[PDB]
DNA sequence: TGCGCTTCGCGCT
């Protein structure tokens, strides 16, 4: 019901040029594997040192609203994240997501990242930790960009229009993420 | 608040 401005989407999910914030689109489906129950998007709480606030990453904001999703513990769910920056360890979700997957075995998590957030020195260990805890960790391709536009954006009937370099950036980042997860 | 560049801000205003 709450949809994203087209400009916000294309300025934040471009897999070639970064932004100083993170958006996260999310979908919950009930598993004989077909039921689409809760959808939305959110961004990080910006760091604001004038109020002495060190910020809250978008993935941690997703964990904050899980209670409000009212997932029935008698059902199995798949949670999908479309995140403009890969999750990280430092000030990140990696540890709390690991904890959240350990204590909630009825939840499967799938994470598609537009870009790799390597500004965290431990970003490799973060991605490896999420995989160890049974999360699927992937790079957004054309299919994921288009699904996100079709589902989360106020497109007003305008079909998704790929930016220049979309497939090239996707392949390069897929290469990097595979070398990280090979280890 | 808005700007200009843009790695979950910064450093001006
Ligand atoms: O593959 P189909 O079962 O024939 O239906 C697909 C499929 O629908 P859903 O995403 O709703 O399940 C696409 O996504 P995939 O499952 O193939 O990944 C979807 O694309 P969007 O999610 O981007 O909307 C696309 O929708 P459309 O063509 O109406 O834009 C639609 O049709 P196509 O397979 O003909 O592309
Ligand atoms: Cl994170």
Numbering used by the authors: 10 to 40, 45 to 196
The authors write:
All structures exhibit a similar crystal packing and a common tertiary structure for the protein (with minor changes on absence of Zn2+). Surprisingly, they also share very similar conformation of the hairpin loop region’s TT(C/FdZ)G moiety. In all instances, the C0 and T−1 of TTC-hairpin bind to inactive A3A-E72A identically to the binding of FdZ0 and T−1 in TTFdZ-hairpin to wildtype active A3A. Importantly, these structures explain why 3-nt hairpin loops with TTC (or TTFdZ) are preferred A3A substrates (and inhibitors). Taken together, the hairpin stem bestows restricted conformational flexibility for the A3A-binding loop region of hairpin DNA compared to linear ssDNA, thereby enabling enhanced interactions with A3A loop 1 residues Arg28 and His29.
